Amino acid sequence: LYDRRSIFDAVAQSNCQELESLLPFLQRSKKRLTDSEFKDPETGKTCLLKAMLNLHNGQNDTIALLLDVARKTDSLKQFVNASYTDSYYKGQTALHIAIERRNMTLVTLLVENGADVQAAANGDFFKKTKGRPGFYFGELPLSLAACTNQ
Amino acid sequence: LAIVKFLLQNSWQPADISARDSVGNTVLHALVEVADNTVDNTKFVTSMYNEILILGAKLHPTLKLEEITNRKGLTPLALAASSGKIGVLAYILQREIHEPECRHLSRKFTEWAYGPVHSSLYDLSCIDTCEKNSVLEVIAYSSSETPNR
Known part of the structure; x- marks a missing residue:
């Protein structure tokens, strides 16, 4: 058996074993x-x-396993495309993060398992500082990737 | 540095890292006294200071070194500010160190960052030190019968 907490801890330490029985x-x-x-x-x-x-070192294979599991149930598309809903990070997807982290490998991986490339990260974290802040590029992966000189 | 280390680390008699001289000054106090606001001066005092703290926390973790008052009631910081040793004052307030046992020592931490963006967190002892003095308060008065203050 698995609750939310169980997996989130497994992920935290890049453990691909505790997710054997997943x-x-x-x-x-x-x-x-x-x-x-x-x-x-x-x-x-x-x-x-x-x-x-x-x-850890721009790496986690809990990702690779996690995705793999989502296709086997074909949660695949909506899984890789789920977004934040709090006012702060609203609309942020995993692809946003991969770019924010300047991680080709993870951009590549997410796009191949079908990350929506037009997903708009539009929460207060992605607009001009309250100061909150900060910081606006606006919204879309391409826009991000350019505004961060990538 | 090497001799600072050998004093504190040797088998024969390790130095008491918190001892006070006739004036109440510890090594951190003395370092503040030895600053003269030149760029290379700050630089060497600043990191020897750093070094002492790293050694304090490694060797004797319980000791809250920066809280120890010289005869006149002054923490190292408060001395720095009483004597217009500004580069060092700025160094002591600014510094945050990340290491095991790092958190107790560090003045400030950065909570979060966004691809753009950064946040800085400050402790801050000077603002909250109502009871004896506030970095501001010594600074706050401020008679400044000196350009540097």
């Missing part, structure tokens, strides 16, 4: 990696997104 779990319960219960109820963060924050 796929077969939501096969029995037919639960989806995308269920309401597998996201933070106030931000909309998913395990993939936790993984995106918990990088």
Whole structure:
């Protein structure tokens, strides 16, 4: 069995083992990696997104496994494309983060598993400082990738 | 530096890192006293200071070194500010160190960043030190019978 907490901890330390029994779990319960219960109820963060924050050397293969699991249930598209819902990071997707981190490899990977390239990150974190701040590029992956000189 | 290390680390008699001289000054106080506001002066005092703290936290973690008052009631910081040793004052308030046992020592931390963006967090002892003096308060008065202050 797996609750939200269980996976998020596994992800935090790049553990691909504690997620050995993962796929077969939501096969029995037919639960989806995308269920309401597998996201933070106030931000909309998913395990993939936790993984995106918990990088070590711009690397995490909990990602590769996490994606793999989502296709086997074909949560695939809406999984890779889930966005933040809090006023701060609203509309931020994993692809936004990969770029923010200047990580070709993870941009490449996300685009190949079908990240929406037109997804607008539009929360207060992506507009001019309250100061909050900060910082605006606006919104769309291309725009980001240019404004950060990439 | 090497001899600072050998004094504190040797087998025969390790130096008491918190001892006070006749005036109440510790090594951190003395360093503040030895500053003369020249760029290379700041630079050497600043990191020897750093070094002492790193050694304090490594060797004797319980010791809150920067809180120790000289005879006149002054922490190293407050001395720095009483004697217009500005580069060092700025150094002591500014510095944040990330290491195991790092957090206790560090003045300030940066909570978060965005691809653009940065945030800086300050402790801040000078503002909150109502009881004896506030970095501002010594600074705040401020008679400034000197250009440098």
